[PDB]
């Protein structure tokens with residue numbers, strides 16, 4: 528498997544398309560691992576990682592994604608692609624160390640997801656909630672990443688100094704934890720404050736950390752930035768997972784919230800429209816302000832918002 532990954536070369540017809548923000552990995556399933564390799568080589572360089580070690584890692588990350596409806600291997604690579612697209616359009620702003628870290632972080636950010644939110648795990652006293660009190664899945668996601676790296680021949684960061692090793696793991700850690708949506712709101716609030724006051728400074732490390740976290744949220748939610756046919760289909764996978772969690776609450780004789788209730792299916796468009804307005808639009812708006820080149824993400828999100836409006840209005 529990993530041996531065949533080393534031999535892979537991306538088709539020429541996709542060389543330009545992959546650079547686009549709205550690129551869908553959808554039709555190219557068996558290429559997803561190589562697509563990641565491609566993005567790493569172009570963004571970090573071919574001399575960045577040992578090829579064999581990188582291929583082992585990717586395949587192990589792959590297998591450690593469960594067959595859940597949404598929080599799966601496809602979502603891992605999709606997010607990793609948005610990160611690539613963001614990094615490619617802001618080539619100067621991010622350090623060599625940040626580029627490696629972020630692409631890996633995105634690929635691993637949902638490692639071994641079960642399809643349950645943190646709320647579910649904490650409410651029903653799951654062992655992971657017993658372990659990680661806050662940002663439950665996210666800490667497990669990072670924990671799984673460290674485990675995969677500590678496997679033999681999987682340590683891709685072995686050619687980096689002890690100091691560079693502890694830096695990149697912290698970059699990954701902060702970035703995976705930043706994918707907790709609960710933390711996004713506070714983060715985006717502070718960022719807008721710093722923008723309008725003009726106190727945003729990318730020399731300041733904690734300001735870098737905030738921007739990266741927003742980038743994470745942006746890359747994580749990037750299903751709302753694809754062409755409508757793709758966005759719509761992915762919305763199905765998201766709700767399939769929401770409802771399965773709701774079903775597990777129903778099995779205990781507990782009514783879930785309408786979002787996780789499949790008997791409330793009809794309100795999905797209005798649910799999306801609100802989510803777009805409250806969460807997605809402000810996310811990409813603030814990101815576009817911070818990184819003008821990422822503007823095609825906001826634009827695409829605007830387009831899907833109006834599609835949802837048309838769904839509600841019946842058009």
Ligand SMILES: O=c1c(OCCN2CCn3c2nc2ccccc23)cn(CC2CC2)nc1-c1ccnn1-c1ccccc1
Nearest residue numbers: 708747748749750751765785786791792794795798799802
């Ligand atoms: O699509 C999303 C979404 O839709 C729900 C909209 N709502 C609100 C009330 N309500 C809705 N549908 C309803 C239908 C009926 C009734 C009330 C309803 C909500 N959330 C946030 C979720 C709480 C973690 N995230 C995404 C999203 C977009 C892209 N990735 N991604 C994501 C992020 C993290 C985790 C999973 C998915």
Ligand SMILES: [Mg+2]
Nearest residue numbers: 636637664706
């Ligand atoms: Mg997650």
Ligand SMILES: [Zn+2]
Nearest residue numbers: 636637706747
């Ligand atoms: Zn995610």
